Design a protein around this ligand. Structure first.
Ligand SMILES: CC(C)CCC[C@@H](C)[C@H]1CC[C@H]2[C@@H]3CC=C4C[C@@H](OC(=O)CCC(=O)O)CC[C@]4(C)[C@H]3CC[C@]12C
Ligand SMILES: CCCCCCCCCCCCCCCC
Length: 128
């Protein structure tokens, strides 16, 4: 089926067809933008992503509840720093600019989802 599969040049046509195809210096806007575009900041945030998945991997059954409290506090810290970086990118870019990346919208959804998870865990008993 692989050998005989009909289509119903190629590279050249694709190249020809695909050949068709920030922020200024005003205020604290520029300060935040200069901070958040620095590759150190992105390396830091991917390191925090790595540490957060490390925290997600450390759950296990019948934890001493001193370990569970540590995991909950670490989740608080990580979601707080993710919210901080999301707000920093908001105040560096524009709102319309931030919401037009297709990744920062995903990050925004996950940050608010984790925040809502944190708030619900306090009063999750009454939902049912
Ligand atoms: C730098 C690279 C290696 C990434 C490392 C990721 C770790 C955060 C992951 C790797 C496998 C996980 C561990 C796999 C084995 C368990 C045993 C579990 O304890 C037990 O089941 C026995 C004790 C008991 O229950 O009575 C506690 C969590 C723990 C250490 C896990 C904690 C998180 C770990 C270390
Ligand atoms: C970075 C993570 C390094 C591994 C730590 C995993 C925690 C081990 C807890 C064992 C059971 C304690 C009770």
């Amino acid at each position: 089926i692989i050998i005989t599969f009909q289509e119903q040049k190629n590279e050249r046509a694709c190249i020809d067809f695909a050949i068709s195809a920030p922020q200024n210096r005003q205020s604290f806007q520029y300060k935040t933008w200069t901070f958040v575009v620095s590759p150190p900041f992105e390396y830091f945030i991917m390191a925090m992503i790595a540490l957060n998945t490390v925290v997600l991997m450390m759950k296990f059954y019948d934890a001493p509840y001193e370990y569970e409290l540590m995991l909950k506090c670490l989740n608080i810290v990580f979601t707080s720093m993710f919210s901080m970086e999301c707000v920093l990118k908001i105040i560096a870019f524009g709102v319309l600019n931030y919401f037009r990346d297709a990744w920062n919208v995903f990050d925004f959804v996950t940050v608010l989802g984790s925040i809502t998870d944190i708030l619900v865990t306090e009063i999750a008993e009454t939902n049912n």
